């Protein structure tokens, strides 16, 4: 059935957003904000007016999506009128952004018709001579908050000076998740900034999510013979308020309120269907969404507890008992083994094997590996590479004492252990202190 293959490919590329520019999907709650972006681009590329603007919104809130849509829409009619320089706050540092801007300037200027040669002082001086009809330079500057540090903000200073005073028209689109982005800026940088902040729209009601799902899953072109029947199946499942798809949209609205989150589950529902009737049954039932939701929680604390052996569960209950009785919540191997040994004698007195410390050591190491115990006052994963490098050159005191004396703390407490251990388990009576 090549028609179902065509319909499945079309549904997948609608869900990945990789349609052509004239066919690309903009949601209703995203129109006006897009139109605002559509003004600023068109005031820079076409009318040669310099702009600086920061888009503020959470992750996966269609900032990059709307910016790429605007650049691709203006790319097909005004191609020689602008160049694009992309910087990212994660990849580019404060010193490597100059080289990134320079090499992007050569690979963009020859694409229409040197800067990046020499030392950093020479390259920055040549950039300042180049920037400080005319071709509009458009800066897309993601994670702008990483360059608004509390020490010195040289690149933001120079770029906003390029917006303010240069004879070359410059458009800067910063993007961030920080709501209070204007307080991050230094006073002179804040003075040179245009104070134009666009906050991305949030989903306000369930009808916005249902309308966006309808936009994502309706085939508005006739490239398969199965398109029409799929459209009435989708409209029947979306217009029914008591359907499974509306229930899953409502669950996403209350918990995540994220259309990429829903798309990551809808994509393997479409892709794993083999024919048209299987796809219709899958979208009517949405049982694959339940299987997806079960798999997304399979490596959490509950699913990791349900994979434990009897001795592992016994040692974990013993360590939780010792941690609940302790005031700092701290324990070691010796106290947990004492609690385990007392528990096994009190079970066998009313058989169950007592394992020796030599064999309980491996169980303890697996429990540390499965993130049930943490080392006491452990920082863990560091935020940046410099702090991790400093941590790698220091010998911690926990790594020099024997393992039976290392202090540990519980990731799950005994009250949480009693809730999800079944009452038919043989160690269930020891989950209450």
């Amino acid at each position: 059935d090549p028609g179902f293959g065509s319909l499945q490919r079309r549904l997948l590329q609608q869900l990945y957003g990789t349609l052509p520019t004239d066919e690309k999907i903009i949601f209703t709650y995203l129109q006006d904000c897009q139109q605002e972006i559509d003004r600023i681009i068109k005031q820079s590329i076409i009318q040669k007016e310099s702009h600086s603007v920061i888009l503020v919104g959470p992750r996966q809130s269609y900032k990059t999506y709307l910016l790429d849509y605007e650049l691709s829409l203006l790319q097909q009619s005004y191609k020689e009128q602008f160049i694009t320089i992309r910087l990212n706050g994660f990849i580019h540092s404060e010193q490597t952004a100059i080289n990134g801007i320079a090499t992007q300037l050569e690979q963009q200027l020859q694409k229409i018709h040197t800067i990046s040669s020499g030392s950093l002082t020479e390259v920055f001086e040549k950039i300042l001579l180049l920037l400080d009809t005319k071709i509009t330079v458009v800066f897309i500057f993601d994670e702008i908050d990483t360059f608004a540090g509390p020490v010195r903000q040289t690149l933001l200073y120079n770029l906003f000076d390029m917006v303010e005073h240069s004879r070359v028209p410059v458009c800067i689109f910063g993007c961030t998740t920080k709501l209070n982005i204007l307080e991050y800026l230094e006073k002179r940088v804040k003075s040179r900034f245009s104070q134009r902040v666009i906050y991305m729209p949030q989903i306000q009601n369930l009808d916005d999510m249902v309308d966006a799902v309808r936009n994502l899953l309706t085939v508005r072109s006739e490239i398969s013979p199965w398109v029409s029947q799929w459209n009435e199946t989708l409209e029947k499942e979306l217009s029914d308020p008591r359907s499974n798809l509306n229930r899953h949209i409502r669950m996403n609205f209350e918990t995540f309120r994220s259309l990429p989150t829903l798309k990551n589950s809808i994509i393997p529902l479409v892709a794993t269907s083999k024919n048209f009737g299987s796809l219709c049954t899958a979208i009517k039932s949405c049982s694959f969404l339940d299987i997806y939701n079960k798999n997304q929680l399979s490596n959490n604390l509950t699913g990791r507890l349900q994979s434990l052996s009897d001795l592992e569960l016994a040692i974990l209950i013993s360590a939780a008992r010792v941690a609940l009785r302790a005031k700092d919540g701290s324990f070691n191997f010796n106290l947990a083994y004492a609690e385990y040994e007392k528990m096994i004698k009190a079970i066998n007195s009313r058989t169950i094997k007592l394992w020796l410390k030599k064999d309980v050591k491996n169980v303890w190491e697996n429990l540390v590996q499965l993130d049930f115990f943490t080392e006491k006052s452990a920082v863990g994963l560091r935020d940046n590479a410099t702090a991790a490098f400093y941590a790698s050159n220091y010998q911690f005191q926990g790594t020099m004492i024997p393992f039976d004396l290392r202090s540990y703390q519980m990731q799950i407490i005994l009250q949480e252990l009693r809730r999800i251990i079944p009452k038919s388990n043989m160690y269930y009576s020891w989950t209450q202190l």
Binding site: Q47, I135, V137
Partner: protein, 485 residues
């Protein structure tokens, strides 16, 4: 030869190492540097950003207004101008070396006044009342390294390209040992002086100690943020050498900002334009349309900006934003695309001024999901009971569980408890965290609403509110469910 690491991206400038002190036999053998071709300055990139235009772009009535209010394109700076011009003129005429300290808040016209003083001095030197001088401008924030100033100034003096230490000794020898009849006066503007402050203060001491030399003929105009920058960040030697007579650039009053904006809009306010009604293109002297921007709107914008900052950039940007809002409404109502009286009203000015005053924190928290609001609400309850301002995440988990299990007769909670704890599904076990727990935790950390401690234990890691508590409560008081319980 096997190398322990490689540096395969070395970019080394072609700058020489021999300083100026070793290129002549003696002090008496140095020739007249004024009569030298490379000395004292005696653009190749401008062609690269030009293209051919094949569309007649439509400039409306407000386009000339918005181009007019740009900072790139002095009624209120006449005493600062007089002081700086008198000091610099007296130092040029008497072959003296001096320091002029200027400081102020952003956008109060410091750089503009210094550049106008320098242009008027060049005009005076063109008609021969003062000896000829070189002008050098060094911005501390446009330097990759702070020592590049040493590389810059000497390159403006001799035309040579040296390394920074060799340039520093070259400048030292030139200022100290070269006689005044053999050299030329140099006026150097040090802009953004706080960026030239290092840990050892080498550059600051060198630049303000060269001004104390007899043979230097060096005038340094140092532009800074504050009056007490030497008394805070510099030693007593540099503070002594800078001096005591320091020039304040105070913020503009509302009359001065109003005069600046009216001097921008002098030729186009209350004027007439030829506007083609089919397209909207406006031509200064088909409908004759009269353009005005009201003086009351400009006045109150000047009053607000003058009370806040005195920033001329802020006043110009507020007026430009009001013109942009009026132009957006005009192009919306007239159906004008991109290829009888038009008034920039006071409501547009008040829309421009309030746009940076409306807070999207409460609006952002109002439109969050139920689980993020439940997180914030439980955190507020913990701050109410134990009063810590930092709450453990396990305490938030147990407080969320308690708030669910106590209000178990609330209809919304009855409808949503299976969603929070099983994702609406059988075959999914009772979970220890709610659904989208780390999702809303990372969402509130991304927005800057929360601060999270760097620990690897998820329960005793603490979380602090980064915003004020009453706006969080306010946002929690808008919701119909969290109001009830």
């Amino acid at each position: 030869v096997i190398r322990k690491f490689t540096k395969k991206n070395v970019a080394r400038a072609k700058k020489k190492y021999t300083p100026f002190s070793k290129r002549f036999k003696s002090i008496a053998a140095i020739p007249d540097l004024t009569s030298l071709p490379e000395f004292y300055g005696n653009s190749r990139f401008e062609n690269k950003l030009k293209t051919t235009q094949k569309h007649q772009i439509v400039e409306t009535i407000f386009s000339k207004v918005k181009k007019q209010l740009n900072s790139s394109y002095l009624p209120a700076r006449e005493n600062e101008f007089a002081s700086i011009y008198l000091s610099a003129y007296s130092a040029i005429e008497s072959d003296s070396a001096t320091t002029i300290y200027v400081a102020g808040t952003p956008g109060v016209g410091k750089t503009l006044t210094v550049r106008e003083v320098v242009k008027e001095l060049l005009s005076s030197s063109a008609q021969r009342e003062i000896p000829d001088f070189l002008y050098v401008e060094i911005n501390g924030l446009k330097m990759v390294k702070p020592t590049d100033c040493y590389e810059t100034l000497w390159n403006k003096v001799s035309g040579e390209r040296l390394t920074w230490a060799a340039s520093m000794e070259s400048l030292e020898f030139y200022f100290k040992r070269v006689p005044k009849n053999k050299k030329k006066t140099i006026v150097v503007l040090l802009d953004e002086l706080d960026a030239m402050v290092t840990k050892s203060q080498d550059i600051m001491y060198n630049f303000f100690n060269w001004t104390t030399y007899e043979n230097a003929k060096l005038i340094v105009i140092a532009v800074a943020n504050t009056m007490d920058l030497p008394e805070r960040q510099l030693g007593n030697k540099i503070t002594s050498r800078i001096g005591f007579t320091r020039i304040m650039f105070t913020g503009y009053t509302h009359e001065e900002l109003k005069n600046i904006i009216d001097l921008r809009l002098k030729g186009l306010n209350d004027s007439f334009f030829y506007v083609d009604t089919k397209t909207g293109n406006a031509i200064l002297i088909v409908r004759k349309v009269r353009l005005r921007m009201s003086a009351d709107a400009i006045e109150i914008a000047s009053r607000k900006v003058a009370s806040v900052s005195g920033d001329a950039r802020r006043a110009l940007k507020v007026c430009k934003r009001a013109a942009e809002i009026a132009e957006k409404h005009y192009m919306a109502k007239h159906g004008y695309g991109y290829d009888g009286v038009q008034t920039v009203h006071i409501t547009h000015v008040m829309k421009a001024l309030n746009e940076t005053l409306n807070s999207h924190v409460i609006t952002f928290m109002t439109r969050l999901s139920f689980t993020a609001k439940l997180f914030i609400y439980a955190l507020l309850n913990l701050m109410k009971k134990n009063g810590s301002q930092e709450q453990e995440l396990g305490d938030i988990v147990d407080e969320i569980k308690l708030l669910i299990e106590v209000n178990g007769s609330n209809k919304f909670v009855m409808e949503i408890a299976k969603t929070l704890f099983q994702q609406g599904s059988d075959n999914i076990s009772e979970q220890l965290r709610i659904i989208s727990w780390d999702f809303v935790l990372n969402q509130l950390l991304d927005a800057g609403i929360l601060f999270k401690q760097t620990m690897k234990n998820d329960r005793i890691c603490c979380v602090k509110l980064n915003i004020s508590v009453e706006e969080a409560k306010r946002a929690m008081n808008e919701d119909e469910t969290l109001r009830n319980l």
